[PDB]
Amino acid sequence: GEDGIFLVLLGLLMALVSWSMDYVSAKSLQAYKWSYAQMQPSLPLQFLVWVTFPLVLILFSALFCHLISPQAVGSGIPEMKTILRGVVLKEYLTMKAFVAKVVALTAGLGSGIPVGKEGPFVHIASICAAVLSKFMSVFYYSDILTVGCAVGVGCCFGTPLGGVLFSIEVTSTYFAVRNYWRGFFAATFSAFVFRVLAVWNKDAVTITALFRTNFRMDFPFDLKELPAFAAIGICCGLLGAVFVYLHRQVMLGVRKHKALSQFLAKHRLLYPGIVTFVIASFTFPPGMGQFMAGELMPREAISTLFDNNTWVKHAGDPESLGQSAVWIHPRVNVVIIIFLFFVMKFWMSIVATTMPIPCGGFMPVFVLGAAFGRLVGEIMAMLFPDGILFDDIIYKILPGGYAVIGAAALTGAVSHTVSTAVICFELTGQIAHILPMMVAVILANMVAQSLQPSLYDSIIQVKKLPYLPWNQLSKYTIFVEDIMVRDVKFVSASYTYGELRTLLQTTTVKTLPLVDSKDSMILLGSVERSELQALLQRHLCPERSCCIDQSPFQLVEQTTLHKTHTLFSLLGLHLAYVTSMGKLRGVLALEELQKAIEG
Amino acid sequence: GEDGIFLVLLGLLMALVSWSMDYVSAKSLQAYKWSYAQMQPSLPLQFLVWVTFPLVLILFSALFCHLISPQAVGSGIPEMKTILRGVVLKEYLTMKAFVAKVVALTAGLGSGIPVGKEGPFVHIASICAAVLSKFMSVFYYSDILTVGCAVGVGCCFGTPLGGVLFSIEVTSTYFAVRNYWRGFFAATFSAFVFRVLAVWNKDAVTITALFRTNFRMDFPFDLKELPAFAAIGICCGLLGAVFVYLHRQVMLGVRKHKALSQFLAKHRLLYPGIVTFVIASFTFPPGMGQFMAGELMPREAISTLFDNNTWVKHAGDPESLGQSAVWIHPRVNVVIIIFLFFVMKFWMSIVATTMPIPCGGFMPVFVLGAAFGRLVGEIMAMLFPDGILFDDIIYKILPGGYAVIGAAALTGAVSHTVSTAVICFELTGQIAHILPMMVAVILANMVAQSLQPSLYDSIIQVKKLPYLPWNQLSKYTIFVEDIMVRDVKFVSASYTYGELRTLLQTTTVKTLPLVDSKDSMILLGSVERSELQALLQRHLCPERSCCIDQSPFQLVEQTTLHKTHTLFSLLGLHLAYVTSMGKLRGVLALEELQKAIEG
């Protein structure tokens, strides 16, 4: 209840900063489109302004990623899912770097290029959670991490339950119940406040999800195109896996040669923008948007792509429809335009996420899934223009739900989870296609689990971070024999004045192994050095309460590394006093286990 | 993948038995209504047939609950959520009692009284999972329990994600990720196959959820009635808590006196039916259904209750609408009919779940939540008949979504969870009212968590079962001093022929504490007695491979009971070799911890 007050204040400021950032980003994009409309149609001058805006904005964000933030480039979720695996980086969790990312992320979201949103927003959300936890309870750790992840994605998209499911279902092994209680509570409140303020100030008539894709919802599917639903898993996940492979094909491409390393050391700044320059050469709407339709910021691009009609029979008319008018070449078949759409988008999304930016890998992946979905919907509308008969009512198909199941399925394959489709129908506003997208997402996840590793697993692999992985292969010859450290810290309780001042003047660390005697070698517990210092100074001052805890563990010295990994996984505890008969024999660390599981 | 084949065969037979049971139940109810229509309107004779059908059917089910099943009366979820807390009852998990429940549950679902469905279906689902796991892997325990619970509720209602959420979120403390993978996989497949077969044989045009409650979904709520949404939590959860209290008011009412105990021992059979007899006297449609409208099996009763119109302005017409025509008295205001509706339903649902039947406590609770929802919707339609203005379109309110948020909210309060509302909108077919029902469910859950215990917690309390509870109150004076058992089983590895045959001829249990020597008292590990017997017989026969595992634990002998409860909770392990300096000093059991936490 009262911790829930902490939670709702958290989600309050989360909704504030989310509304602020997308408000300013939308104003920026509409101001750009305002000017680019209003000046004149001059093909040197439209090209001029078309190349002036993006890289000024992008390299402004890149300056903020470079100079103020020392290490926060390429940030997102995999570093904090490694933090909940144990490796703490408090210098990386800096509040000052916090502001260094988000407004740059605003300039990231100010980009006309597709960018990532949620991963950095998850990270800065966990920053907000940790800092406000520092401010509160004076006026539990991976709990705050998991809560931060849940409220971050659920305040990105106003999606509570898919947000908490997307937090817990991948970034854990076990999970505590007070944490999901806090999770859905703050996530529901965050999704609540995020939607109302756009009705408070700048009308968003009362509630959509974000996107109301209106359908007839009467005889929707049917099950005759259900074998076509076979396709809506399989190849989708296939190409998603290829994406992962190609991402590694450029991550090694980050550091395959020394010459680009040397010129990067010569000047770090110029590298992303120039190649964005050439896809700026592949964005230009009257030059090459004649054959790509580059007039599409991705949000309204997919809302227009979610049009509840058949564009093959709307290839029958030259009618001024809504924004879907941008989907017509006057003499080229529109299956060819969806061809050039998906091909240019997949080989531009890779270099979009390649550049040194804190990037999530979800939103261009959404637009390619939606592209494939309305692709297959329009081409089977071409193959079957007939529809069915029903009681005095002909029911033909429509590809909007096909677009939304593609933009659930392929990104679920990419994300190696199922919560992505939960976000997908939760933003869709209608829940006709639930069990087909569920079947497709589990098909694509088992394809992707069969073939390739994850995105973020490959990310922590290439970045070579300290992580725990494992793969359930307990071989014959692995023993804890060269791993424990036979350095022994020790305190006897029998230490008097000189010995106590010696302990004051010698050691450094926060808590200590406490034994009976150093000849006994048998551990008793662990004691705060700080409490000892406090007791000694506050007994030495008034011149002129021994509480004891225990060590909950012992490593029997012939345990396999897989079962020891399992042990530290279920404990969630860091170090090991590997003893024999009570008598301490070695010290085992988490990083030592990681270096062992290298083998 | 291949364990997923086991999973989909499981969910296949689950969908088979679910389709079978509700198919036969629907045929039974329509055959009853067929006869009760077709004979004649005679008030002695309609009363005659009206009292003949139900208790014949009910006491048929009660005979199956009594005679064939020795202990399976009052079954459901709380016994198996206690089983995953450790207490195994394999005699209670009998396949033969399995068939003894379900067809009786069919006669339970054949009843015109509101009954429970999911709890017994969860239990028999876990029975199916355990038996098929016994049959497979020859051609992990609470994993099978949690999978059984998830697939049971998700095959009850065709609801995968709310089903797996309803399995995990209450019946656990920690939870493993392979288990939810299996969970949503089989749950999605079960929900898939359950819906298609009603289109295969007996048309259910292709896909609803179950109930397509069609709404205008255009300016739906608005936020001006949002303070009325304050009410839709609070009092709802209030009365739900009163329900729990009143349930205990009859559970003690089960065993408050000795005279009814003596007459129950005289003949167990007659007790439920007679009081059902008198509410049969409170069911009769021309006698007292003039003032209760008893012509309502609950499924179509709530689908009719989900009518997307205002019955106050439809109190304006005598028009033959659909089934909603049964909601009219020709001279009594319909707020008074909803008065008698909710009052008779809440004091009949208690004695419905009271009787010795395996019963869930959800479906009449759904109908009272829906009753309160359309109650408040119709009365604010009376208070505000105006609606709003919009662009040449007047938008007035409609109480169907109000009915569905009530039938999410109060049953979420009753169930002490949030997954119930997930099932609610997942069966609703439209997801307009998501964030209001989320806000209402968290309000009602915090009210119910503030006031009263759970249903099933009170159930295991009154049934006095062996369970672990706790309540985060570590007092000053609790120590593990009178709890460990100083009986020591011991085997030395140095035992030769006569000593080994002595160990063969003496002990009983499956695995044993293995020590170095009995004078050492220091435990080494645990060894299967069966493997020892096998080695000795298969070395004694060919006349005429010592593998060693370790004991992963030690209880330091001054641990508090709350932290020891926490220890066994996080381990998921049963017994404790409480040693000192290696040397074994006591044996601590789970039931001993339960008897300690009695204090």
Short mmCIF file of N, CA and C in Angstrom, two decimals, chain B residues 97-164:
data_model
loop_
_atom_site.label_atom_id
_atom_site.label_comp_id
_atom_site.label_asym_id
_atom_site.label_seq_id
_atom_site.Cartn_x
_atom_site.Cartn_y
_atom_site.Cartn_z
N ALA B 97 -10.43 -42.85 -9.25
CA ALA B 97 -11.27 -41.79 -8.72
C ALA B 97 -11.48 -40.68 -9.75
N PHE B 98 -10.53 -40.56 -10.69
CA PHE B 98 -10.59 -39.62 -11.81
C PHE B 98 -11.93 -39.69 -12.54
N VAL B 99 -12.24 -40.86 -13.08
CA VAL B 99 -13.51 -41.10 -13.76
C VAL B 99 -14.68 -40.94 -12.79
N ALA B 100 -14.44 -41.20 -11.50
CA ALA B 100 -15.47 -41.04 -10.49
C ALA B 100 -15.87 -39.59 -10.28
N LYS B 101 -15.03 -38.64 -10.67
CA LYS B 101 -15.40 -37.26 -10.45
C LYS B 101 -16.05 -36.64 -11.68
N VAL B 102 -15.40 -36.83 -12.83
CA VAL B 102 -15.63 -35.99 -14.01
C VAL B 102 -17.04 -36.16 -14.55
N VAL B 103 -17.52 -37.40 -14.67
CA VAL B 103 -18.87 -37.62 -15.15
C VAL B 103 -19.88 -37.16 -14.11
N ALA B 104 -19.53 -37.30 -12.82
CA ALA B 104 -20.32 -36.69 -11.77
C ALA B 104 -20.27 -35.18 -11.88
N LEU B 105 -19.09 -34.65 -12.22
CA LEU B 105 -18.97 -33.24 -12.55
C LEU B 105 -19.80 -32.90 -13.78
N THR B 106 -19.91 -33.84 -14.72
CA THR B 106 -20.83 -33.67 -15.83
C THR B 106 -22.25 -33.56 -15.33
N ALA B 107 -22.63 -34.44 -14.40
CA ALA B 107 -23.93 -34.29 -13.75
C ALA B 107 -23.93 -33.06 -12.85
N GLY B 108 -22.76 -32.67 -12.36
CA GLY B 108 -22.63 -31.36 -11.75
C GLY B 108 -22.88 -30.26 -12.75
N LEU B 109 -22.33 -30.39 -13.95
CA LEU B 109 -22.57 -29.36 -14.95
C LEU B 109 -23.91 -29.58 -15.63
N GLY B 110 -24.49 -30.77 -15.48
CA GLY B 110 -25.86 -30.98 -15.89
C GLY B 110 -26.88 -30.29 -15.01
N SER B 111 -26.45 -29.75 -13.87
CA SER B 111 -27.38 -29.13 -12.94
C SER B 111 -27.83 -27.77 -13.44
N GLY B 112 -29.09 -27.46 -13.14
CA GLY B 112 -29.56 -26.10 -13.28
C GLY B 112 -29.11 -25.19 -12.17
N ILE B 113 -28.52 -25.74 -11.12
CA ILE B 113 -27.95 -24.89 -10.07
C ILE B 113 -26.58 -24.41 -10.56
N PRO B 114 -26.10 -23.24 -10.13
CA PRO B 114 -24.74 -22.85 -10.49
C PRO B 114 -23.71 -23.68 -9.73
N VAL B 115 -22.73 -24.19 -10.46
CA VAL B 115 -21.74 -25.10 -9.92
C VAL B 115 -20.35 -24.57 -10.25
N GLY B 116 -19.36 -25.26 -9.71
CA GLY B 116 -17.99 -25.02 -10.07
C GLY B 116 -17.51 -26.01 -11.11
N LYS B 117 -16.65 -25.51 -11.98
CA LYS B 117 -16.14 -26.21 -13.14
C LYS B 117 -14.64 -26.41 -13.10
N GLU B 118 -13.89 -25.34 -12.86
CA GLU B 118 -12.49 -25.32 -13.26
C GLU B 118 -11.61 -26.06 -12.26
N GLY B 119 -11.93 -25.94 -10.96
CA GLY B 119 -11.16 -26.52 -9.89
C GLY B 119 -11.05 -28.03 -9.96
N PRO B 120 -12.19 -28.73 -10.00
CA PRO B 120 -12.14 -30.15 -10.35
C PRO B 120 -11.56 -30.43 -11.71
N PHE B 121 -11.77 -29.54 -12.69
CA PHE B 121 -11.20 -29.79 -14.01
C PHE B 121 -9.69 -29.61 -13.98
N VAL B 122 -9.21 -28.65 -13.18
CA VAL B 122 -7.78 -28.51 -12.91
C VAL B 122 -7.22 -29.77 -12.27
N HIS B 123 -7.94 -30.31 -11.27
CA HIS B 123 -7.46 -31.48 -10.55
C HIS B 123 -7.39 -32.71 -11.45
N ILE B 124 -8.43 -32.94 -12.25
CA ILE B 124 -8.42 -34.10 -13.13
C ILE B 124 -7.46 -33.88 -14.29
N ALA B 125 -7.21 -32.62 -14.64
CA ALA B 125 -6.20 -32.30 -15.64
C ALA B 125 -4.81 -32.67 -15.14
N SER B 126 -4.53 -32.36 -13.87
CA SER B 126 -3.26 -32.75 -13.29
C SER B 126 -3.15 -34.26 -13.14
N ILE B 127 -4.29 -34.92 -12.90
CA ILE B 127 -4.33 -36.39 -12.92
C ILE B 127 -3.93 -36.92 -14.29
N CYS B 128 -4.52 -36.35 -15.35
CA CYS B 128 -4.17 -36.74 -16.71
C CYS B 128 -2.70 -36.50 -17.01
N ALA B 129 -2.17 -35.37 -16.54
CA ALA B 129 -0.77 -35.04 -16.76
C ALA B 129 0.15 -36.04 -16.07
N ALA B 130 -0.17 -36.39 -14.82
CA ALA B 130 0.66 -37.32 -14.07
C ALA B 130 0.60 -38.73 -14.65
N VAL B 131 -0.59 -39.17 -15.05
CA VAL B 131 -0.74 -40.52 -15.60
C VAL B 131 -0.07 -40.62 -16.96
N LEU B 132 -0.18 -39.57 -17.78
CA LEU B 132 0.46 -39.63 -19.09
C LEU B 132 1.97 -39.46 -18.97
N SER B 133 2.43 -38.75 -17.93
CA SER B 133 3.86 -38.73 -17.64
C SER B 133 4.34 -40.08 -17.16
N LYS B 134 3.48 -40.83 -16.48
CA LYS B 134 3.82 -42.21 -16.13
C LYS B 134 3.89 -43.09 -17.37
N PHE B 135 3.00 -42.87 -18.33
CA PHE B 135 3.02 -43.67 -19.55
C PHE B 135 4.14 -43.26 -20.50
N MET B 136 4.46 -41.97 -20.55
CA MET B 136 5.54 -41.50 -21.40
C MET B 136 6.85 -41.58 -20.61
N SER B 137 7.97 -41.34 -21.31
CA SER B 137 9.36 -41.38 -20.83
C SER B 137 9.79 -42.79 -20.40
N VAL B 138 8.99 -43.80 -20.74
CA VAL B 138 9.36 -45.20 -20.61
C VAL B 138 9.09 -45.87 -21.95
N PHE B 139 8.35 -45.17 -22.81
CA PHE B 139 8.08 -45.66 -24.15
C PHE B 139 9.09 -45.06 -25.12
N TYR B 140 10.64 -32.32 -11.02
CA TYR B 140 9.80 -32.43 -12.21
C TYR B 140 8.34 -32.53 -11.80
N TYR B 141 8.12 -32.58 -10.49
CA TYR B 141 6.82 -32.96 -9.94
C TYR B 141 5.84 -31.78 -9.94
N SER B 142 6.17 -30.73 -9.19
CA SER B 142 5.32 -29.55 -9.15
C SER B 142 5.31 -28.80 -10.47
N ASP B 143 6.30 -29.06 -11.33
CA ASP B 143 6.22 -28.68 -12.73
C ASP B 143 4.97 -29.26 -13.38
N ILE B 144 4.77 -30.57 -13.21
CA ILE B 144 3.59 -31.24 -13.76
C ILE B 144 2.32 -30.71 -13.12
N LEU B 145 2.38 -30.37 -11.82
CA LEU B 145 1.23 -29.76 -11.15
C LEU B 145 0.85 -28.41 -11.76
N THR B 146 1.85 -27.55 -11.96
CA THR B 146 1.59 -26.21 -12.47
C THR B 146 1.13 -26.24 -13.92
N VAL B 147 1.73 -27.12 -14.72
CA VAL B 147 1.29 -27.34 -16.10
C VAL B 147 -0.15 -27.84 -16.12
N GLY B 148 -0.49 -28.76 -15.21
CA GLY B 148 -1.85 -29.27 -15.16
C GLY B 148 -2.87 -28.20 -14.81
N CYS B 149 -2.52 -27.32 -13.86
CA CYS B 149 -3.41 -26.22 -13.50
C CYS B 149 -3.62 -25.26 -14.66
N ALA B 150 -2.52 -24.89 -15.33
CA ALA B 150 -2.59 -23.95 -16.45
C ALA B 150 -3.43 -24.49 -17.59
N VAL B 151 -3.16 -25.73 -18.00
CA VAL B 151 -3.88 -26.31 -19.14
C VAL B 151 -5.32 -26.62 -18.74
N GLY B 152 -5.56 -26.88 -17.45
CA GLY B 152 -6.92 -27.13 -17.00
C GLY B 152 -7.82 -25.92 -17.13
N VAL B 153 -7.37 -24.77 -16.63
CA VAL B 153 -8.24 -23.60 -16.74
C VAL B 153 -8.25 -23.05 -18.18
N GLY B 154 -7.11 -23.12 -18.88
CA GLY B 154 -7.07 -22.67 -20.26
C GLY B 154 -7.78 -23.58 -21.24
N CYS B 155 -8.13 -24.79 -20.82
CA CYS B 155 -8.97 -25.65 -21.64
C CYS B 155 -10.42 -25.65 -21.17
N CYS B 156 -10.66 -25.27 -19.91
CA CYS B 156 -12.01 -24.88 -19.49
C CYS B 156 -12.55 -23.78 -20.37
N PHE B 157 -11.80 -22.69 -20.51
CA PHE B 157 -12.37 -21.52 -21.16
C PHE B 157 -11.68 -21.12 -22.46
N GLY B 158 -10.75 -21.93 -22.97
CA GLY B 158 -10.07 -21.57 -24.20
C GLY B 158 -9.17 -20.36 -24.06
N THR B 159 -8.53 -20.20 -22.90
CA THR B 159 -7.86 -18.97 -22.51
C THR B 159 -6.42 -19.27 -22.10
N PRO B 160 -5.47 -19.20 -23.04
CA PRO B 160 -4.10 -19.64 -22.74
C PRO B 160 -3.34 -18.79 -21.73
N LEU B 161 -3.24 -17.49 -22.00
CA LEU B 161 -2.32 -16.67 -21.23
C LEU B 161 -2.88 -16.33 -19.86
N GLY B 162 -4.19 -16.07 -19.76
CA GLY B 162 -4.80 -15.93 -18.46
C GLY B 162 -4.81 -17.23 -17.70
N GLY B 163 -4.83 -18.35 -18.42
CA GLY B 163 -4.76 -19.65 -17.77
C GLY B 163 -3.41 -19.92 -17.13
N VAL B 164 -2.33 -19.65 -17.87
CA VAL B 164 -1.01 -19.88 -17.30
C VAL B 164 -0.70 -18.83 -16.24
#
